[PDB]
Paper text:
Ceramides and dihydroceramides are synthesized by six ceramide synthase (CerS) enzymes, each with specificity for different acyl-CoA substrates. Ceramide with a 16-carbon acyl chain (C16 ceramide) has been implicated in obesity, insulin resistance and liver disease and the C16 ceramide-synthesizing CerS6 is regarded as an attractive drug target for obesity-associated disease. Here we report cryo-electron microscopy structures of human CerS6, capturing covalent intermediate and product-bound states. These structures, along with biochemical characterization, reveal that CerS catalysis proceeds through a ping-pong reaction mechanism involving a covalent acyl–enzyme intermediate.
A covalent bond is seen linking the acyl chain to the imidazole Nε of His211 (TM4), an absolutely conserved histidine that is required for CerS activity. To further confirm this covalent adduct, we determined an additional CerS6 structure in complex with a second nanobody, Nb02, to a nominal resolution of 3.0 Å. The overall CerS6 structure is unchanged between nanobody complexes (TM region backbone root-mean-square deviation (r.m.s.d.) = 0.39 Å), with the improved local resolution in the active site validating the His211–acyl link. Thus, on the basis of the extended density in the cryo-EM map and the observed mass adduct, we modeled a palmitoyl (C16:0) chain covalently attached to His211. The acyl chain is surrounded in the narrow tunnel primarily by hydrophobic side chains from TM4, TM5 and TM7. Within the acyl–CerS6 structure, the carbonyl oxygen of the covalently attached C16:0 chain is within hydrogen-bonding distance (2.8 Å) of the Nδ of Asn315 (TM7).
Author numbering:
A (entry chain A), C (entry chain C): 2 to 330
B (entry chain B), D (entry chain D): 1 to 123
The structure:
């Protein structure tokens, strides 16, 4: 109890001359509260179950109708030395590792590379599950982006970025903003539940840090009444995530022309939104306008660094994209 | 409903200086941003000026800048619009309004809890 | 919104002449609310992570120190017909199925039974994971039972069962009762999350219905201010669950004398608590005293049937126990 | 704090019948169960009787059954203890109390918001 009071220091989060007692829910006005963010976990569980239903009953028949391979991986040829190396040394040999294995086994590099690729495919999930997951991600990202566009088209802060800090902290909470924030937090918690359980043996790096940072930002911005600028970030970031899933779906059906086109479009949208628009527009409204209109708050040192972290992430992935696009030309 | 009552109006000679007051019978007038709107005879309502809860931002109309000033006193719960160098354009009925979702726009449909309205006459 | 108002009909749950407006949280008195049950999901997630940490860092070294087999199952001898039958016909042949397989393959019944047992062990989880899960269950059940005993020892309704309906609906909510209910609901939701994710390929029958019924009862009793009688059920049912896990742990270390003793004790406690005490004491206070003191409520038709359902479950499992105890003699 | 004020006391002749009243200056007296306790001279507080919010359950002491009756009126916010066939044991100072967690016990430490207390004299 006392440690929670220490953590929620009103002189750290809220700006000068502002107390939590000012943001309590009164008769005529409703303000966002931390207690409203507990529904996110139940909604994430409901989303997880709906995802399971969609994958097994809606995506699998479509994959069957599109000649996706319904069987598992292939079987690697038997080899004692290769099996010992795969179980002991590593699972994804590099060029130097392939050369060393060829020297040790006195075998061609192509055969060892094919054997290790087959073993990796055995360890990797089948194409059917990846296709179903990509279809679910595409549908959810398209819904979220469309709802965000419909919500933002009427708001006064999309055109002028100095309207997110208009009457701070006295900005009432609307149904649309609450629904958008709860839906986003629920989706991120659903991704969490899916990753710590179903995929605890797949990936736990850049996308787990990305998820954690996104949940951190969404929660602490919602508690701090700094949510008008968060909708612009959520809608900007979800613009490009609806094309990568379509490109993956085109890839998994062995369509390379559509996959190449959709990936050139995803690359263009990703670069334009997350390298040209995001820093100049959102970090402008965040680093300088927020501190000018709202005043000196210390939470700014936490929030901008995190957004800069996100920007670093979204610059690494863009190098990864610029080379694939070079391969796609 | 914090129904406003605009007072402070009469007839002023041209090139004059007149102060107007809007009084709110409520306890939560200090969290809201408020604005002053005018309704020209045989015309629709226009946006004259607006002010945020703590006087941080004062938005004016492109026709009243300099000539018109808006201020508010939280303890008294009153808003004071001082008009200066009054031209004949100012002749209308002024209504004091309240902003409902802190949107910062220039619109008649975002401002609720309107008032009966005070009248000004400019020669 | 309207459908929720239809579901929470005050003439169905609350008794005669009682409205939800009477149970709202006032200045001097705090009453339980549905909104307080949203913390259960976050606490269940925290419990799930603590369970993972305990299993990998606290239970696995102990299992290693106790010579539990750290490797996987064995390898069944190759057989085309046996593999085809296992993949197509069934996985756990009965006596008639074993006789049919022996007739078809012209092989001894013992060899086919051993091959199918080896295949089942291949499909079944290793002893290490079962030992770790049993240790976690034992620790959690022992903690919950001990806290329930400490809480109930001071309450006035454990000795007299007519003190659960004393001042209904005006019974204030204490910290201990709220903590107990939230802890139980969080544990049941943790079991849910573990079963729909980690063990979605293991069991989905009597224990999933049992979990669902337990969550139903705990939630709707907490919302209805019928929680004084629920603590007696929770503490009665968690008395025997702390010995079955110890018996399983003794079994997995190849200790048969302690396993037999602990299972005779678990059988005695289970029968005594859930066949002798539960019906005569709790269904007495529930079927008749509740309706006498509180009056005619229609939710009684929902709650007693569910408790009777639980009793049916706890009679089936007891037949299953009475035969194992016969084998244990 | 709904501090009770016990009234209705005086000196009565033996084998008498006396009514006592406890009045609560609060708005939420109707959700609580209340009890009447007595403190015998040179002795500790004893449990005389108790009543729930709606008169459903009336618990008495094994020494006062029949002879003593408890009732309450919600509109007036008052509790009436009617004592009958008064023996010399009844001589003490009576205090009207309130039950805090609806526990239904017979104890002095569960009853808070006590009152100054009325006095009875039995010859
Ligand atoms: C390099 C990594 C970057 C960031 C690391 C990722 C950490 C973030 C992951 C956890 C999310 C944080 C909170 C999740 C639960 C939501 C909390 C909530 O709604 O209520 C706050 C609850 C309830 O608090 P409360 O109810 O006492 O306070 C409410 C009252 N006011 C208005 C003052 C806030 O408290 C917390 O959870 C606070 C601690 C958060 C943990 C932060 C760790 C970092
Ligand atoms: C044979 C099977 C036996 C039983 C089947 C198992 C079903 C039970 C599994 C789901 C649990 C039910 C509710 C879980 C979430 C907790 C709900 C909560 O805290 O708030 C109620 C929420 C929020 O409701 P609310 O906030 O509008 O209402 C609060 C106001 N009063 C005081 C009037 C209640 O609503 C629901 O979830 C109601 C529907 C429950 C679904 C029941 C399906 C059966
Ligand atoms: C991954 O690249 C996408 C991450 C999406 C980020 C979502 C964060 C939204 C909340 C932003 C809150 C910032 C407000 C603080 C500014 C001072
Ligand atoms: C499995 O055998 C154990 C299940 C444990 C049951 C827990 C349920 C506790 C809540 C009981 C509420 C009943 C109150 C309604 C009576 C009218
Ligand atoms: C904060 O409030 C104090 C007194 O309430 C006042 O003296 C000070 O000027 C205020 N500062 C700001 C930045 O509003
Ligand atoms: C319920 O209340 C009504 C009026 O409020 C009354 O006439 C009726 O007797 C009450 N019934 C019970 C069982 O209290």
């Amino acid at each position: 109890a006392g440690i929670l009071a220490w953590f929620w220091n009103e002189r750290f989060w809220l700006p000068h001359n502002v107390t939590w007692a000012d943001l309590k829910n009164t008769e005529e006005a409703t303000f966002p509260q931390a207690e409203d963010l507990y529904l996110a976990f139940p909604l994430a569980f409901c989303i997880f179950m709906v995802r399971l239903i969609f994958e097994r009953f809606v995506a699998k028949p479509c994959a069957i109708a599109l000649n996706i391979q319904a069987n598992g991986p292939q079987i690697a040829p038997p080899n004692a030395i290769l099996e010992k190396v795969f179980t002991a040394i590593t699972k994804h040999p590099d060029e130097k590792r392939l050369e060393g294995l060829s020297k040790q086994l006195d075998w061609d590099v192509r055969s060892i590379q094919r054997w290790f690729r087959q073993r990796r495919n055995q360890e990797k999930p089948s194409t059917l599950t990846r296709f179903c997951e990509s279809m679910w991600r595409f549908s959810f990202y398209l819904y979220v982006f469309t709802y965000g566009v419909r919500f933002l088209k009427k708001t006064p802060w999309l055109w002028n970025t100095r309207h997110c800090w208009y009457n701070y902290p006295y900005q009432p909470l609307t149904t649309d903003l609450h629904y958008y924030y709860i839906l986003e937090l629920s989706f991120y918690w659903s991704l969490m539940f899916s990753q710590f359980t179903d995929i605890k043996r797949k990936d736990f790096g850049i996308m787990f840090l990305h998820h954690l940072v996104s949940i951190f930002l969404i929660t602490f911005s919602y508690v701090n009444n700094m949510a008008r600028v968060g909708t612009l970030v959520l809608c900007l970031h979800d613009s490009a995530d609806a094309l990568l899933e379509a490109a993956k779906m085109a890839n998994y059906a062995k369509f390379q022309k559509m996959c190449d086109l959709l990936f050139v479009m995803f690359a263009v949208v990703f670069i334009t939104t997350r390298l040209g628009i995001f820093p100049l527009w959102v970090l402008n409204t965040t680093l300088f306008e927020s501190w000018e209109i709202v005043g000196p708050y210390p939470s700014w040192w936490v929030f901008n660094l995190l957004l800069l972290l996100v920007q670093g992430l979204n610059c690494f992935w863009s190098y990864l994209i610029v080379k694939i696009a070079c391969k796609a030309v | 409903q914090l129904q406003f009552v605009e007072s402070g109006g009469g007839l002023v000679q041209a090139g004059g200086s007149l102060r107007l007051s809007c009084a709110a019978s409520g306890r939560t007038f200090s969290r809201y941003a408020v604005g002053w709107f005018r309704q020209a005879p045989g015309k629709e309502r226009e946006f004259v000026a607006s002010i945020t809860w703590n006087g941080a931002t004062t938005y004016y109309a492109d026709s009243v800048k300099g000539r018109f000033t808006i201020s508010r006193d939280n303890a008294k719960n009153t808003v004071y619009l001082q008009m200066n160098s009054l031209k004949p354009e100012d002749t209308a009925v002024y209504y004091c309004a309240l902003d409902l979702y802190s949107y910062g726009t220039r619109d008649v449909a975002d401002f609720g809890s309107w008032g009966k309205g005070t009248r000004v006459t400019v020669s």
